[PDB]
Amino acid sequence: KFTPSIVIDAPQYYVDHFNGKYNVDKCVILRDLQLETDSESMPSSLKHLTKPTHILDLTNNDLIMIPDLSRRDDIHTLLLGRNNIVEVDGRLLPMNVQNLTLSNNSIRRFEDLQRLRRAPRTLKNLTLIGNQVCHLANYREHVLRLVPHLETLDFQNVTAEERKSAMSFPRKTMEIMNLVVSKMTVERRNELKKQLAEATSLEEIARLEKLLSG
Amino acid sequence: XXXXXXXXXXXALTEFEANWTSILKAHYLADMEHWLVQRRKKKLMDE
Amino acid sequence: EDVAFEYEIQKTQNILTWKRYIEYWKEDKQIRWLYERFCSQFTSIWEDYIRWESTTSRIFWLFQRCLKSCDCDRICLSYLELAIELAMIRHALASSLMREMHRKVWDPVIKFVEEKVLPLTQTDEAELINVLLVKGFIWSSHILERYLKVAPQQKRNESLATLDNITIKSVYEKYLPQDENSGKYLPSSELPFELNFNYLASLEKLGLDNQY
């Protein structure tokens, strides 16, 4: 799927988020398109990615790995949430990356994250909320051991004692449908249940899948 | 090629003849999309 | 695999749906029903493809059922008439009601062959002896009769005379001139002598004595 044509028509604009007032950082949007990792096609597509790019929004696709953007130095922010990522191989993050998002991916053991050792020293912000290694035992204290100089995980500010302690060691789309149901008024649950029992057309299923996902 | 056979057809005892000649013949959307809706209901209903 | 094929079909576009159905069938009652439904949405080419997938009575039965709701299927029915070598040969002819005149010309090969079988299955002294002894006291015709309304030549009419007698009389009456006041069927020199003798033999076989 990862063509050299869809990266060139990729919608793009300047955004103020990183500086407040002046539109001096540029986002490339590759979200909501179901791209997936091909070992031949993809590295011959991302060499048509526009320069400079500051924010690269690869969210809500079917990637299975960090796309190799290793040698590029413009990209500071790299959004990879809602992707089928397995392991975070840090050598394939961009050279001067600062700010990485891996929310709601498929990472489940500490040997998946183990290659974050090779991520850039200037990586300061990370996000892993909604993964399943997120829930494993004392996971924060482990991943801090891998990247001690980091500044944030899961939007928790890494405080002084945490990174001080880090030096002690040497010595599937239905996720969102459940996520809405987890966070819903019990009477509205007992109303959309009835609506699903009442359902009478394929287009009315489509409308009911709008409600079941916002 | 005369095409005078317009609005007419061939004309029974010939039926009985053909019954005897059997030896001569040897001697020589809505009904599916409903189900799809129900299947999709089944897939959704667990969650 | 087939779940994706059925899901694609829901989006439908008849040719693409047919291709997806063929792909699903590759890896047959449901497939036959789906093809019939697509043809109902369309359709003769689908029936031809069904016949190709077949390669037998059920095929001709479906051909006849579809023919009632209908040109290569006419070729298929005529080929079934060739396979009658047998009432479906006439049924195929009834289905040919749709150049415009070429529908008769497919039958005479079968008609001549039938004339070979049925008349074959049906000496000076003995000829008188047997004739003295006597003194002690049909679909094939209709095929030829239908063609001879519009047929071009007497080389066809020769084959009719090999069959019967009331039909043979009844058509030859249109080739024999009337008498000026009796309306009697006179012989003609436009006919050749052998056919006149055949008509004579027709009147003799029917025992129409005064007319003979």
Is A63 within 8 Å of A36 (Cβ atoms)?
Answer: yes
Touching chains, A (3+ CB pairs < 8 A): B
Cα distance from N-terminal residue to C-terminal residue, chain B:
72
Q: Which of C78, C11, C90, C14 is nearest to C49 (CA)?
A: C14
Residue numbers after which chain B breaks, C to N beyond 2.5 angstroms: 11, 28
Residue of B nearest to C36 (CA): B29
Could B37 and A212 be called an inter-chain contact, meaning their C-beta atoms sit closer than 8 Å?
A: no
- Please provide the DSSP assignment of chain C as one string: -HHHHHHHHHH--HHHHHHHHHHHHH--HHHHHHHHHHHHH--HHHHHHHHHHH--HHHHHHHHHHHTT--HHHHHHHHHHHHT--THHHHHHHHTT--TTTTSTTSHHHHHHHHHHHHHH--HHHHHHHHHHHTT--HHHHHHHHHTTT---HHHHHHHTT--HHHHHHHHTTTSPBPTTT--B---SSS-HHHHHHHHHHHHHTT-TTT-
Question: What is the 3 state secondary structure string of C60-105?
Answer: HHHHHHHHCCCCHHHHHHHHHHHHCCCCHHHHHHHHCCCCCCCCCC
- Chains B and C form CB pairs within 8 A to the count of 68
Question: Which residue carries 């001096």 as its tokens?
Answer: A24
How far apart are the C-alpha atoms of A132 and A82, rounded to whole Å?
13
Q: What are phi and psi of B18, to 5 degrees?
A: -65, -30
Three-class secondary structure of residue A156 per DSSP: strand
CA B38 to each of CA A3, B19, C42: distance values in angstroms, whole numbers, following the listed order: 37, 52, 27
Q: Answer whether B9 touches C (CB < 8 Å).
A: yes
What would the DSSP string read from start to end of chain B?
---TTTT-----HHHHHHHHTTTHHHH--HHHHHHHHHHHHHHHHT-
User: Would you call C5 exposed, middle or buried from its count of C-beta atoms within 10 A (0-12, 13-18, 19+)?
Assistant: middle
Residues composing chain C: 212
Q: Which residues are CB-neighbours of C113 under 8 A, at least 6 positions away?
A: B28, C85
The partner residues of A125 in beta bridges, in order of sequence, read A99, A152
Is there a contact between A112 and A89 (Cβ–Cβ < 8 Å)?
Answer: no
Report the candidate in C107, C102, C105 with the shortest Cα–Cα distance to residue C92.
C107
Method: cryo-EM
Q: Using the 8-state DSSP alphabet, how is residue A182 labeled?
A: H
Cβ atoms of residues C185 and C143 within 8 Å:
no
Q: Dihedral of CA B14/B15/B17/B21: which sign?
A: positive
Cβ distance A168 to A187 under 8 Å? Answer: no
| Tokens 């063609």 belong to residue | C147
Q: What's the CA gap between C150 and C156, in Å, rounded?
A: 11
Of A177, A181, A201, the CB nearest to B37: A201
Chain C residues inside the 8 Å CB shell of B24: 86, 114, 117-118
- Chain C residue with Cα closest to B31: C37
Rounded Cα distance, C211 and C196, in Å: 14
- Give the pair of three-digit tokens for residue C42: 């369309």
C-alpha torsion C68→C73→C79→C83, nearest 10: -50
Q: Which two tokens stand for residue A117?
A: 């050792």
Answer whether A130's CB lies under 8 Å from A104's CB: yes
The length of chain B, given as a count of residues: 47
> Cβ atoms within 10 A of the Cβ of A30, count?
23
List CB contacts (< 8 A) between A212 and chain B. Answer: 44
- How many beta carbons lie within 10 A of that of residue C109, not counting itself? 13
Contact, A73 vs A87, CB < 8 A? Answer: no
ω into A52 cis (within 30 of 0):
yes
> In whole angstroms, how far apart are CA B8 and each of A197, B5, B15, C13?
60, 6, 20, 40
List % helix, strand, coil for chain A (3-state, nearest 5). Answer: 30, 10, 60
- Tell me if chain B has a CB within 8 Å of the CB of A182: no
Q: Contact A35/A12 with Cβ under 8 angstroms?
A: no
> Does any CB of chain A come closer than 8 Å to the CB of residue B36?
yes
| Chain B: partners with 3+ C-beta pairs within 8 Å | A, C
From CA C211, how far away is CA C160, in angstroms rounded?
A: 21
**Alpha carbons B10 and A34: distance in angstroms, whole number:** 66
- Between strands A152-153 and A156-157, the pairing is antiparallel
CA C62, C64, C66: angle at the middle one, nearest 5? 65
A201 CB near a chain B CB, below 8 Å? yes
First to last CA, chain A: 28
H helices then E strands: how many in chain A? Answer: 5, 8
Question: Residue A13 in 3-state DSSP?
Answer: strand
Q: How far apart are CA A171 and CA A193, in angstroms?
A: 57
Gyration radius from chain A CA atoms = 20
CB A67 within 8 A of CB A37: yes
Distance CA B38, CA C52 (A): 35
Report which of A89, A10, A113, A21 is spatially closest to residue A55, judged by C-alpha positions. Answer: A10
- Distance (Å, rounded) from C-alpha A18 to C-alpha A77? 10
* Tokens encoding A38: 């091909």
A208 near A196, Cβ under 8 Å? yes
E strand or H helix at A152: strand A152-153
